[PDB]
Design an enzyme around this catalytic site. Sequence first.
Site, mmCIF file in Angstrom:
data_model
loop_
_atom_site.group_PDB
_atom_site.id
_atom_site.type_symbol
_atom_site.label_atom_id
_atom_site.label_comp_id
_atom_site.label_asym_id
_atom_site.label_seq_id
_atom_site.Cartn_x
_atom_site.Cartn_y
_atom_site.Cartn_z
ATOM 1 N N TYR C 117 -6.653 -4.904 -2.008
ATOM 2 C CA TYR C 117 -6.535 -4.122 -0.782
ATOM 3 C C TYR C 117 -6.445 -4.976 0.472
ATOM 4 O O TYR C 117 -5.819 -4.554 1.450
ATOM 5 C CB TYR C 117 -7.726 -3.169 -0.630
ATOM 6 N N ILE C 118 -7.050 -6.160 0.471
ATOM 7 C CA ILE C 118 -7.136 -6.998 1.661
ATOM 8 C C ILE C 118 -5.947 -7.945 1.701
ATOM 9 O O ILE C 118 -5.405 -8.350 0.667
ATOM 10 C CB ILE C 118 -8.472 -7.769 1.703
#
Lengths: 273, 273, 442, 442
Positions: C117-118
Amino acid sequence: AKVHKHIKANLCGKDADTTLFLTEGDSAIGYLIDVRDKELHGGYPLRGKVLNSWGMSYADMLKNKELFDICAITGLVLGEKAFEEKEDGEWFTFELNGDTIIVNENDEVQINGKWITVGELRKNLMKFVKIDSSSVDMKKYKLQNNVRRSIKSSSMNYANVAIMTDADHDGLGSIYPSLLGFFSNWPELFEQGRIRFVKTPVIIAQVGKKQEWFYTVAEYESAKDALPKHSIRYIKGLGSLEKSEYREMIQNPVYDVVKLPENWKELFEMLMG
Amino acid sequence: AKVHKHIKANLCGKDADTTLFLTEGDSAIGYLIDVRDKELHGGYPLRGKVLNSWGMSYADMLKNKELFDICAITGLVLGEKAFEEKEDGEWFTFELNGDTIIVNENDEVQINGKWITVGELRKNLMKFVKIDSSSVDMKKYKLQNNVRRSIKSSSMNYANVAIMTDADHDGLGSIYPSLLGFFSNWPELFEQGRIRFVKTPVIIAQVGKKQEWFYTVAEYESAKDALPKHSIRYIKGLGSLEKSEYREMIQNPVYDVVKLPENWKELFEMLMG
Amino acid sequence: MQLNNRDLKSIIDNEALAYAMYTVENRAIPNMIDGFKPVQRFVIARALDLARGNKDKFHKLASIAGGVADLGYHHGENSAQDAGALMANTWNNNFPLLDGQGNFGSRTVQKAAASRYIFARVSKNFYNVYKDTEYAPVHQDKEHIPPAFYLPIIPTVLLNGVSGIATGYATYILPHSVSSVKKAVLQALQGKKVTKPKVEFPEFRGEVVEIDGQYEIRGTYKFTSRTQMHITEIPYKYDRETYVSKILDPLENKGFITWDDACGEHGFGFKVKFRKEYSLSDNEEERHAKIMKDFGLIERRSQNITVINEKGKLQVYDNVVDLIKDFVEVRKTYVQKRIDNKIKETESAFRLAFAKAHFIKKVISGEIVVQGKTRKELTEELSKIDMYSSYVDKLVGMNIFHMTSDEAKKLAEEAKAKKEENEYWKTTDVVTEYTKDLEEIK
Amino acid sequence: MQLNNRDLKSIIDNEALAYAMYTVENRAIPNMIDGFKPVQRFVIARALDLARGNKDKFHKLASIAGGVADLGYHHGENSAQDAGALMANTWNNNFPLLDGQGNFGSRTVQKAAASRYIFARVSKNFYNVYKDTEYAPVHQDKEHIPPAFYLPIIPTVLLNGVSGIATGYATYILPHSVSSVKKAVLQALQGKKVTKPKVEFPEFRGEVVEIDGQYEIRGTYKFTSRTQMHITEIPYKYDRETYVSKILDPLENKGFITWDDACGEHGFGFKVKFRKEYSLSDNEEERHAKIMKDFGLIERRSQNITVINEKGKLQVYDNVVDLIKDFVEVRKTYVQKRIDNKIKETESAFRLAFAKAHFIKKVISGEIVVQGKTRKELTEELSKIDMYSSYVDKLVGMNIFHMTSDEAKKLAEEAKAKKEENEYWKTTDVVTEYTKDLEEIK
């Protein structure tokens, strides 16, 4: 007892509004501790997959640490009603934002995000139309999210539960429907508008200074043309929003309040049952 | 009993030499079925990490399926000498490829990859110099890989065990010394030279039609300059050689024939002990 | 059938010296010159690789951690995932070399979000400090695409702070402030008495004091009333989970206090209420000393500066001053490499440009009749000229718009400018070019 | 504070059908047009991306499997590894679309080596068949970098053979020979009666016969003596391990036979010794039938042709003839798209080439004086001409050597050839340009 991962609002169990958050993963709590209002923004991380509570008995739900914590955090006691309704004998109707609203004299009405008693509202000199109880639309009344249904006393320490998960498959075939089965043990919660889901934006533009939040892909294509030099950021999870963006999503959230119909007990068997 | 993953040489236990291979992984022996001579090229795949056998009990030595299979495949009896030496009272010396070789009248000598009895050799009119047994160099005699030390009868069905493994860390901190610990239960094997390690090339050139096999990185840099338009292929494992190259590695192999010195029992405790 | 006589001695010996080689490559000790752990270097090289096209484009950390295997890393993507997360966040690094988008954690919670996600990218800090990448030494193992060590302007190992445990060695360097390290290197460049760099933890509002060779990490506290206290900062190694559980929880269990959570955007914070059971001395110092002891507001840390020098040999430094004095010595010759290499390029560029400018002056007036000829004939008729010969391919392989007046002047000025640039590199040394470059970092 | 009223119906029906879309994205059913499962399509796209620079460079299969995450794959790297291993080897495909180096298994042992040791590349078959990649439909999901389906000349799904199990559907297509499929597609292009393609398993020396709609996979055996038999081939689905364990192990246990392993480079092989306990009928056909029965040399397979069509809808075909007809009908549209785009590109290229040639012609004789002017002024005086309207940047940006006579003739010839090519594209149709492309595959 005291719960470790229980970042706790100051006004917990003080006859005041609360917005306790159930966010997946301890990392998503990383912003929450820094972007709370320190008054009503309680939170509790939960990492994993919450077990199905529709085939496993009440006395053993305290065995599960995640399930026991939610009851301990919320103050819920299994087997009893979460609230206590105050009886009433009056009914009124009024127009709000172009919509007809059916309310009772003992109910709570939300205006601009603030809940005001009907008795106080009637003193503000705006038109209330009294109707008979037999002419009240029960289906329309129970589907109003701006009306709170005559709470007398509550054993809750946290007023509301704000479920917040990701948008990808770690949010779809995951926690999201699982707690709703757990929270189904108190059907009064959903009709009361207490079990709430925070809508995480999926696509965010980068026009100029500010940004535009697109909660669905359908809303993106329909508004892509009117976006001047838009930059696209697929938010497929909570851990993809910057600190400022998460702060806005908390202080000015878009809430997906879940309301349970008369069909509610059948669907919990069709999925996860 | 019959072993499933025991692709077996035709001349197994027929008073003939064999080259039983212990290759890691059932995938790496996929060539072996297609590149055997069908006479002496037995094979047995083994995927995993063989349990340490130094200090290991005999009770679960036969319980381990991988360890029991090797004894069953080789026909070995644990705790008993694999061979039976034939006694002798003569000694001879001769020059072979510019090297002095100490042999016995009852020994076997390998010439051009073929083992010939000393008695048959002495009939071929090449010079043999008889020496006294007291003047025999035991250390030099035991370190000769072209001499077989007077085998009378053998309980083995597979004459030799040609260990073959990868070159990367999947062999280093792995099977590579582990089987030598198990095979140390018969020290007569290493002094005889039956346990062998097939050297896998590490860097292969692609000059012209044929190719150059570089077994060590040090050999690569020393001969890189004399390589006309060389193409490099890091063979970090058995599963990186084409079918033709694996055929050459089998029909014309080079063996790191390990030998067991007087220090041998000390090192088995230093590593893996 | 080449039967060898390798014996068992080398079998055990070659089983070792390769496990050590498997360990010498993954030593957690940071390299002195660049400040990168082996897991950290591959992530930076992978992040640099993805940033060749678009420098400001953020890449998923899974892609960054998933590409290190191609570069040469052996320990999978799980180890490279943590190193990428610990680089981007500003709570763990005083000088973050990776600019990160997403949930990389904070002081309150040090856990980064899932790597899928990052996002991460090489930061503007990296390009300001990590210069002369093209001159970095080539790794001894040809499989390792990333160089042996990058060539930062300042000793990055002292900036972000490095901690690690190895077999027989341990490393622990406190994060030193960027502003002071830059001052220390400049003094070392001129050979002056180098001041000890000031240790400053990132996003730390507390007090750090150097006592008897030990760094005491002191938090700050202010009293709101006689029995109510508000902690405003706490030692670095606590997060909100470890502080509350290890310190505040047992004291609440002991009944001394009833603490209240006040952590927010402004770092840490804890409002604590004192009960009657707890005893507070009337002396201000005694209360100050007692409070900082039971609450764990004072922490002592000892630096163990073990770094790998430019020769790949583990070295132990008594103090950061010796490391900086040795660091500039190693960095000086690499600057000298730039001076030597820039002289060659500028000299080569000038002759190519000066000859290129002379095509016009010959063409425009009357000299070189390109107007009708054979292409092979044209090259031979100008390859005879010594000046034109060396760059005949480029000199002819030239755009048509160079034949107009305004571009003709621009070519002449560019050739003239290159001579000034070439002269500038010839009459400059390390001190001038390492002080000029030590003025862009911030 | 926008409070919505989505109820439980909408929440549950959005939690559901999300799994349906997720499993539709990765469905084992092969697409009819390209013949790729989604994992195979992602692997092929990653291999093409890696081989963009060097076509013949072999890449580690671990890199190929790890790169699919960037492209849009969701189910990890093990599925990509398996797809690459099963697509590269020649024992599983008549038309391998990935040339592989390393241990990809064989008929005797179908296990491929570890993906970190084996290499893979796109083969010449892929470039011979999979044409018009630029015109492939863009995937509906923008995250899926690989197109919805590639555009092979022939229905690859029939060549390598596809087997898969889906929720409510099962796909099983026997591998058909490349030459017969090419002949069938050529017949379908011209509208002739298409012959049923002949099924031919890869590296199969046995006999395949079509009985009552079922394909009987028959092995071959020869007798060396009265009681000695030598198996020469066995049905396809057996490898050495499973065939031995399921056939020769129990019969040896039953005491009927004492088999001898004889598999080598020439496929399979088994020398079998007949004992006295086993009974052999004197009749030839009865003995043949008994041998084929007990030894499992006869295998019956039924085709379940379920493929995803060009519209993303699951489709079931009774026989391969209709599938080939539909595939040719779909591919005709993409061939027409290629015709139109090639017409446009050739027209534009001819206009640009004619402008370049005429600029050169004007320069060499007396017309356009580049010999001293302003660049913007030259652009205006040569763009006022209607023919050099939108080509000013390319036309001025030409090279110096173009002004020679030989390059002028080359430019004129190139312009004439471009005119001829544009006329050829204009005066050609789908049938001609598809039959021409159906003459290079082998």
